[PDB]
Symmetry: C3
Subunit: 123 residues, 3 copies
């Protein structure tokens, strides 16, 4: 009269939830790439923005032997303040990412053991 | 002496976990929009960056009947290399998104069936 | 002959799944910061882009007592259309975030109660 069949359905339900959780992890990685990808496009713009500073006045002198060049900075590059903070952000994801993989590994081992014990009850 | 009540609590717990998983899916969609939204702002800037290239020298000639115009490219537009790669990124999310919805549908059907069988045991 | 030990493994498995779900929430917050962080870099560029509009022609007049200044807008700033829509986006995350925390709190209370009842069965 034991509800072993009910447990078989419940054990299967947990396995399905674990799979969806794993799918979220892969989807999260794709979203992270988009953020990093945007930075790459931004860096290209920074090189072009510096060029705009170089553009100042062409032929602005036809009665003098001099050229006015004013390459005033344009793109504010982050060397330590924003760059250092970004590294901290990436490191936090790494620690959380490692913990998630560890729990998933333990869940998989425990999930298989629960199904294994269930089979012995009604093998 | 069967622990049917305990199972009722366990079955309910799985339902709550499924709901949170669904909430993460909707939250993920909001984050994806932010990434796409940033690109839209960037495209507007690209149109303005091209205009800066047009700006070169105004009135830089009052003793000549000519104007120096130097519209050197400014924003590097991605037509195939980055655009094609981005499409691959969106497609991967679609495949994972479809799989997540499929598992959720199966989980909902299985979740209701588990509760249904439980009611028959003590209906 | 009750499978209380099997239930102990199943109850533990749900607890592990809850922890991974919580890890995803913290990871999601880190991803949200990256999107907001990119906007901050963009705002800095907008101030520099306005400066490029100021750059027009230096010394483009050595036979006239006038200077041609053309500060044509460069960065299109969003005051109500995009800004208002962004607020709606943040609000949606808040509602979903609150619901996720509420379910997690209820799951934790229910999770502990399920383990507590299990101990009484075999305390």
């Amino acid at each position: 009269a034991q509800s072993r069949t009910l447990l078989a359905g419940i054990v299967q339900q947990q396995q399905q939830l674990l799979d969806v959780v794993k799918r979220q992890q892969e989807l999260l990685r794709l979203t992270v790439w988009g953020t990093k990808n945007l930075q790459t496009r931004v860096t290209a713009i920074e090189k072009y923005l510096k060029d705009q500073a170089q553009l100042n006045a062409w032929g602005a002198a036809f009665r003098q032997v001099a050229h006015t060049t004013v390459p005033w900075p344009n793109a504010s590059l982050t060397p330590k303040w924003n760059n250092e903070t970004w590294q901290e952000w990436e490191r936090k994801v790494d620690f959380l990412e490692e913990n998630i993989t560890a729990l998933l590994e333990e869940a998989q081992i425990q999930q298989e053991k629960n199904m294994y014990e269930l089979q012995k009850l009604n093998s």
